[PDB]
Amino acid sequence: TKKKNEEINKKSLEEDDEFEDFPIDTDDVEVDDDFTNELKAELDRYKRENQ
Amino acid sequence: IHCLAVRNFKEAAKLLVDSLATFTSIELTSYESIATYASVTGLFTLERTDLKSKVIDSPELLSLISTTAALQSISSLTISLYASDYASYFPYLLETYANVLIPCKYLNRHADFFVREMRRKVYAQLLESYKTLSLKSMASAFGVSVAFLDNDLGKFIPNKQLNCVIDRVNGIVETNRPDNKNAQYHLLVKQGDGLLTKLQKYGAAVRLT
Amino acid sequence: LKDVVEYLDKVINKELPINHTILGKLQDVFNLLPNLGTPDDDEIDVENHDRINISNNLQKALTVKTND
């Protein structure tokens, strides 16, 4: 009950909680590189071999 | 299965290689599946000697031959990694994707990380033995064009496993060599840094009482 | 050292004898005097890093005991 005064005082300095204001108002990207690699391997190969 | 199912392979390899010694099919996916899966995990986890032995000098895998196409592809990969035959590495990499990774329920989700992770391990390996290489040399060995290699290398380098640069105008590939007392120094401070932070966090807490 | 130094002044000014033994011994001191830019100097620096390194790990280690 002691800590409680402080928790309410902080919230008020924020105003509400923004936390809930936002939803009301509104190499992890790396593509599988296997598909691109397949194309690469094959074009190089064709030329290499028949060179 | 619980481990395989998630991304972490470290744990799986350790239980699933052991199931080679003893398998029971009771309410469990047949032994042939376990042979294939043990091999995939195998590659990702153990270092040179040990891993090689575990995924090759195993009597069981040799006795079982290549009876289905999927177990073939993965074993072919294993051969080429170990044998340092880097021409056939890339064809073998593509086969394993189509026929091992996707039939698998478990590695469906993890196809993306796995196949990419293999291109990095293999490249590291070639570079380790060489002070310097040429782009034209390196390129040829794998069976990709010179341009292609460069692009795909530029992904691996800042992420850092290759430990390398390309002096482009000259076309040579240099491999930074801080493996020594310097290495051991750098690692040791970072680990020290990690202990230092924890002490503060805990210190500050008790101190309030 | 100071005693050696004022003694040398007296030899060439106040006619204390030329005792060849004393002078003879001083040559070893100048020949076997340390030098810098030797690869020994580089060697000392490697050792210096080692000892400070161990000092820090041990320093942190005491911080843990007292905190218990």
Whole-number Cα distances in Å, C64 to A46, B36, B187, C59? 65, 48, 21, 9
- Contact B41/B4 with Cβ under 8 angstroms? yes
Per the CB < 8 Å rule, is B202 touching C57?
A: no
Length reported for chain B:
209
Token pair for residue A7?
């928790």
Interface chains of chain B (3 or more CB pairs under 8 Å): A, C
Per the CB < 8 Å rule, is B155 touching A27?
A: yes
What residue ranges do the domains of chain A occupy?
7-51
Token pair for residue B13?
């390899």
Indicate left, alpha or beta for C5 from its phi (over 0: left) and psi (-120 to 50: alpha): alpha
Tokens 């989700």 correspond to B109
Interface of B with A in 56-95 (CB under 8 A): 90-91, 93-94
State which residues form the domain around B147.
Answer: 130-176
- Contact B172/B134 with Cβ under 8 angstroms? yes
Query: Which one of B7, B96, B145 would you mutate to disrupt binding with A, by most A Cβ within 10 Å of its Cβ?
Result: B145
| Closest by CA position to B36, among listed B64, B9, B7 | B64
Query: Which one of A29, A30, A31, A34 would you mutate to disrupt binding with B, by most B Cβ within 10 Å of its Cβ?
Result: A34
Per the CB < 8 Å rule, is A30 touching B116?
A: yes
Indicate left, alpha or beta for B86 from its phi (over 0: left) and psi (-120 to 50: alpha): alpha
Per the CB < 8 Å rule, is A44 touching B115?
A: no
3-class DSSP assignment, residue B134 = strand
Interface of B with A in 129-188 (CB under 8 A): 140, 143-145, 148, 152, 155, 159
Tokens 């177990």 correspond to B71
Token pair for residue B117?
């992770």
> CB neighbours of B15 closer than 8 A, spacing ≥ 6?
B3
- Contact B77/B43 with Cβ under 8 angstroms? yes
Contacts of C60 in chain B (CB under 8 A): 192, 195-196, 199
How far from the centroid of its chain's Cα atoms is residue A42's Cα? 33
> CB neighbours of B115 closer than 8 A, spacing ≥ 6?
A32, A33, A34, B93, B96, B97, B101
Tokens 């840094």 correspond to B193
**Gap between the Cα atoms of B37 and B41, Å rounded:** 6
Backbone angles phi, psi at B151, to 5 degrees: -65, -45
Per the CB < 8 Å rule, is A37 touching B159?
A: no
Cα Rg of chain A, angstroms: 29
Whole-number Cα distances in Å, C39 to B178, C29, C31, C43, C44? 21, 21, 18, 6, 9
Laid out side by side, the sheet with B132-134 consists of B132-134, B172-175, B164-167
Query: Which one of C58, C67, C68 would you mutate to disrupt binding with B, by most B Cβ within 10 Å of its Cβ?
Result: C67
Whole-number Cα distances in Å, B58 to B1, B49, B78, B96, C7? 21, 13, 13, 20, 85
- Contact B43/B118 with Cβ under 8 angstroms? yes
How many C-beta atoms lie closer than 10 Å to residue B77's C-beta? 23
Contacts of A45 in chain B (CB under 8 A): 143
Indicate left, alpha or beta for B46 from its phi (over 0: left) and psi (-120 to 50: alpha): beta
- Contact B17/B38 with Cβ under 8 angstroms? yes
How far from the centroid of its chain's Cα atoms is residue C37's Cα? 16
How many helices and strands, by DSSP H and E, does chain B display? 11, 3
**Residue B196 near chain C (CB below 8 Å):** yes
**Gap between the Cα atoms of A29 and C39, Å rounded:** 51
How many C-beta atoms lie closer than 10 Å to residue C22's C-beta? 13
- DSSP for chain C, please give it: -HHHHHHHHHHTTS-----HHHHHHHHHHHHS---SSSHHHHHHHHHHHHHHHHHHHHHHHHHHHHH-
**Gap between the Cα atoms of A38 and B90, Å rounded:** 9
